[PDB]
Amino acid sequence: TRLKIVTIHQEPFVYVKPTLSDGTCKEEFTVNGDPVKKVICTGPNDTSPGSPRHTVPQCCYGFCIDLLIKLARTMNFTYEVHLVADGKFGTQERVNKKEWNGMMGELLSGQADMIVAPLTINNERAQYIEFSKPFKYQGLTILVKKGTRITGINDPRLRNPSDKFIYATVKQSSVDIYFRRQVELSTMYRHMEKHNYESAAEAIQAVRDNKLHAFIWDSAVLEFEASQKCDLVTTGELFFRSGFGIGMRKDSPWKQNVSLSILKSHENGFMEDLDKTWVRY
Amino acid sequence: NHLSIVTLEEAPFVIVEDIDPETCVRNTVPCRKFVKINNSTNEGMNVKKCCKGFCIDILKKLSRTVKFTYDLYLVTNGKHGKKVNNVWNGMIGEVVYQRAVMAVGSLTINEERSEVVDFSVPFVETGISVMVSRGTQVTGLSDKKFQRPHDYSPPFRFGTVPNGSTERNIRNNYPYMHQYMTKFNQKGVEDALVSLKTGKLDAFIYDAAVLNYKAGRDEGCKLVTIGSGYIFATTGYGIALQKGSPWKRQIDLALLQFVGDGEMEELETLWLTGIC
Numbered sequence: 101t102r103l104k105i106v107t108i109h110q111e112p113f114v115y116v117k118p119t120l121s122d123g124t125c126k127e128e129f130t131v132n133g134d135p136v137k138k139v140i141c142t143g144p145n146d147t148s149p150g151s152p153r154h155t156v157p158q159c160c161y162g163f164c165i166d167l168l169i170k171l172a173r174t175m176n177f178t179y180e181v182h183l184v185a186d187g188k189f190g191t192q193e194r195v196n197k198k199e200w201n202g203m204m205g206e207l208l209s210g211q212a213d214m215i216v217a218p219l220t221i222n223n224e225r226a227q228y229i230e231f232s233k234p235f236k237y238q239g240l241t242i243l244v245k246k247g248t249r250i251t252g253i254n255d256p257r258l259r260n261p262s263d264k265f266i267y268a269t270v271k272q273s274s275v276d277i278y279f280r281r282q283v284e285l286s287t288m289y290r291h292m293e294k295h296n297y298e299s300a301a302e303a304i305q306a307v308r309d310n311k312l313h314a315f316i317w318d319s320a321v322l323e324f325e326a327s328q329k330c331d332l333v334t335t336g337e338l339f340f341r342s343g344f345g346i347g348m349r350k351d352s353p354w355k356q357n358v359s360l361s362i363l364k365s366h367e368n369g370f371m372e373d374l375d376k377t378w379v380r381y
Numbered sequence: 382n383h384l385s386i387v388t389l390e391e392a393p394f395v396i397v398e399d400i401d402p403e404t405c406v407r408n409t410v411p412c413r414k415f416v417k418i419n420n421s422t423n424e425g426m427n428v429k430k431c432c433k434g435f436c437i438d439i440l441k442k443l444s445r446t447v448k449f450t451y452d453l454y455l456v457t458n459g460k461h462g463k464k465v466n467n468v469w470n471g472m473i474g475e476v477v478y479q480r481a482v483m484a485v486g487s488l489t490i491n492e493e494r495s496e497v498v499d500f501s502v503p504f505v506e507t508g509i510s511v512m513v514s515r516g517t518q519v520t521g522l523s524d525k526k527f528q529r530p531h532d533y534s535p536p537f538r539f540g541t542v543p544n545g546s547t548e549r550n551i552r553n554n555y556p557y558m559h560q561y562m563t564k565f566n567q568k569g570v571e572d573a574l575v576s577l578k579t580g581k582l583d584a585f586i587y588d589a590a591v592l593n594y595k596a597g598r599d600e601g602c603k604l605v606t607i608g609s610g611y612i613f614a615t616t617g618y619g620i621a622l623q624k625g626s627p628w629k630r631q632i633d634l635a636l637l638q639f640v641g642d643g644e645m646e647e648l649e650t651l652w653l654t655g656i657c
């Protein structure tokens with residue numbers, strides 16, 4: 101009964117770093133002087149799409165790793181962490197047959213028993229998996245280079261686009277799902293499907309490099325990025341609100357106790373402390 | 382698929398009105414309330430009333446999408462839900478003891494209630510907020526004025542409305558603050574707001590969604606929530622269903638669909654916006 105946990109690289113929720121030469125993780129401390137809890141997470145090294153993937157042990161830490169450690173202690177389970185083989189969160193695509201990719205596919209195929217990541221709760225995924233009660237409430241916003249003038253989601257450069265102002269999201273993500281479903285955003289969706297990125301880090305870098313004019317993504321990630329990279333800014337408020345949850349198969353025997361532990365952590369200040377440690381500052 | 386549903390009045394989530402001169406019209410739905418004939422009898426009458434509000438519009442949308450009809454009634458044994466001598470009263474109790482298939486209203490999701498009922502996904506964010514007169518200097522629930530109140534001359538005067546999720550959280554987390562506060566218990570939100578406005582109270586600690594609505598509608602924008610609407614012990618309002626309910630799957634998916642297609646945002650604009 102050793103749980104296979106799947107995660108994804110996504111600062112500040114999941115930091116991914118190489119192990120030291122001896123295969124251990126570098127000893128680090130917060131501003132509070134408390135040791136940083138780290139876990140060994142196996143995963144492929146960064147490679148282009150359609151290439152062989154070579155799996156190696158890596159170091160994982162962050163909000164979601166601290167949360168996993170607390171759940172494992174409370175519910176008394178052991179685990180092994182791995183990074184999603186295709187590097188994606190997960191969407192359902194047509195192959196008559198339909199298949200889930202990313203962490204969604206891994207959980208549904210039994211490659212993982214639990215998704216512990218900044219995984220958006222939405223109708224499309226809830227039809228197939230069980231989400232816990234949310235551990236974080238946030239939404240969608242837009243990241244731009246300081247000096248770029250966007251009013252927000254209703255900016256004409258977004259609603260009536262051209263090849264002059266390039267905006268995108270991350271492929272096979274909840275944002276991709278949102279824009280594909282909402283017919284009112286179809287003009288935006290068609291522009292984005294031409295420029296979508298393989299990962300949030302690549303998209304953030306492209307904004308810095310002036311290769312991407314606007315990146316549409318999770319506010320919990322974009323506000324953290326803007327607070328560290330002062331050449332980047334978020335534009336406006338949230339145009340949509342969504343929460344993150346733990347993902348499990350519908351027949352999981354841990355489902356009720358995962359949600360009770362999450363509720364206990366919201367009520368006793370534990371989740372607020374994690375938020376202050378990782379997501380704020 | 383004709384379901385017994387329980388609610389509780391708490392504006393703007395659930396608003397109760399007298400029936401017309403003799404059915405429910407406009408954006409209202411029929412809701413009944415058991416009213417005693419006197420105090421020397423168990424005899425009473427179900428009084429036909431009309432219900433409206435943010436949670437009622439959600440119920441109307443769920444009834445249509447999930448395909449059920451309902452008999453809506455107002456809880457008379459307590460309010461939201463409190464475990465007294467290990468027995469649940471209020472909306473939670475109605476669901477636990479199978480008098481209602483579900484409870485709809487300004488019902489806070491918390492750990493102890495989740496052990497006895499299943500909750501839907503949250504449809505509104507809530508938790509604990511602190512209401513004060515504009516300018517009052519408090520850092521949050523951790524402020525020394527709240528944690529160690531007798532360290533101040535005169536001590537800070539603050540209270541909540543007892544027996545709900547807020548008092549339960551305060552009792553669990555801050556034992557001293559809790560025993561101190563009880564002398565400042567408010568009968569309801571309306572009494573608490575009058576006590577604040579007239580300087581008989583320094584702070585009112587209550588449900589975040591209600592406080593943020595009240596601060597947004599305050600005459601003269603005098604009463605505000607600390608930390609620009611900061612929410613402590615974040616949770617949400619959820620529909621309470623019986624453990625193992627066959628309705629939970631469809632209710633959860635419909636709620637997520639309403640959020641996703643903008644229907645939920647339309648209801649927030651209709652019921653929860655304020656000038657402040």
Ligand SMILES: CCN(Cc1cc(=O)n2c3c(sc2n1)CCC3)c1ccc(F)cc1
Nearest residue numbers: 233234235236237343503504505506616617
């Ligand atoms: C993370 C804190 N949170 C607030 C929250 C979270 C959340 O996804 N949503 C959503 C709503 S309203 C809401 N409120 C509309 C769209 C999704 C919470 C935590 C524990 C709960 F049992 C319930 C809620």
Ligand SMILES: N[C@@H](CCC(=O)O)C(=O)O
Nearest residue numbers: 461488489545546547588
């Ligand atoms: N919404 C709360 C009632 C108000 C409160 O105690 O803050 C509950 O369900 O108990």
